[PDB]
Design a binder for this molecule. Structure first.
Ligand code: NDP
Ligand code: IXE
Length: 206
């Protein structure tokens, strides 16, 4: 009653797998903002009327979101923390692992519920990404690759774009990214903030 759904990871990272610096993201990318909001919020119209996507995030990532942007609107938010006592407010769900979050979600958004789970996204940070990359239901990575070795203090845990992982993770065609996201997506290099970046979708077989 717990693993009938794939997990998707969404991440922005450098070519050296850097993902963060000083509890924030060391870049200011307008399209990337638009894209993260769209991908995590989009529900295909063939999915049920009640459907909403889930964002799962680590406690440090939650604490990095400014209060005025919390919870992330139009998505079911879950914070993974081993601190049972931590008050999230607004009915935001708290869970002590990735699988505890999945069990809580299925228990809460059940047969009857006016809200039903659609896609489930892991949105960071580094420690939660490590658990997700180990999870047997993770099959899809929406990667924004940043073409500059911007100095970071936190790194992505598995080098999924590198030769060593290339028999498991495969980059899909841009039109398949656009099919899955349901909307035209900029194709190829985008240049803001002094360097190029681009959107990619990588998948693996479970
Ligand atoms: N580039 C990107 O796409 C993204 C980058 N980031 C960057 O990541 C950095 C933060 O990463 P990190 O410090 O790793 O923080 P996380 O957001 O992963 O938060 C870590 C805390 O979350 C909880 N936690 C995480 N994983 C688990 C687990 N598997 N089981 C139980 N609890 C877990 C623990 O909370 P507790 O201590 O309360 O028990 C842990 O101390 C920041 O720089 C941020 O800006 C964040 C999101 C996206
Ligand atoms: C953690 N985070 C974030 C932080 C905030 F303060 C926000 F208001 C927000 F919408 C997202 C964030 C931002 N952009 C991202 N982009 C990609 N591609 N992947 C992520 N997981 C991500 C997370």
């Amino acid at each position: 009653m717990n693993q009938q759904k794939s997990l998707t990871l969404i991440v922005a990272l450098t070519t050296s797998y850097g993902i963060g610096r000083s509890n924030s993201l060391p870049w200011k990318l307008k399209k990337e903002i638009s894209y993260f909001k769209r991908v995590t919020s989009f529900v295909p119209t063939f999915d049920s009327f009640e459907s909403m996507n889930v964002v799962l995030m680590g406690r440090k990532t939650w604490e990095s979101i400014p209060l005025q942007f919390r919870p992330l609107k139009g998505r079911i938010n879950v914070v993974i923390t081993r601190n049972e006592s931590l008050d999230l407010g607004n009915g935001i769900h708290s869970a002590k692992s990735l699988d505890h979050a999945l069990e809580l979600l299925y228990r809460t958004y059940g047969s009857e519920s006016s809200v039903q789970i659609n896609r489930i996204f892991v949105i960071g940070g580094a420690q939660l990404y490590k658990a997700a990359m180990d999870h047997p239901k993770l099959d899809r990575i929406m990667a924004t690759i940043i073409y500059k070795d911007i100095h970071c203090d936190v790194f992505f845990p598995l080098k999924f774009r590198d030769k060593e992982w290339s028999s498991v993770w495969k980059k899909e065609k841009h039109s398949d990214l656009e099919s899955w996201v349901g909307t035209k997506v900029p194709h190829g290099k985008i240049n803001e903030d002094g360097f190029d970046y681009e959107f990619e979708m990588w998948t693996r077989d479970l």
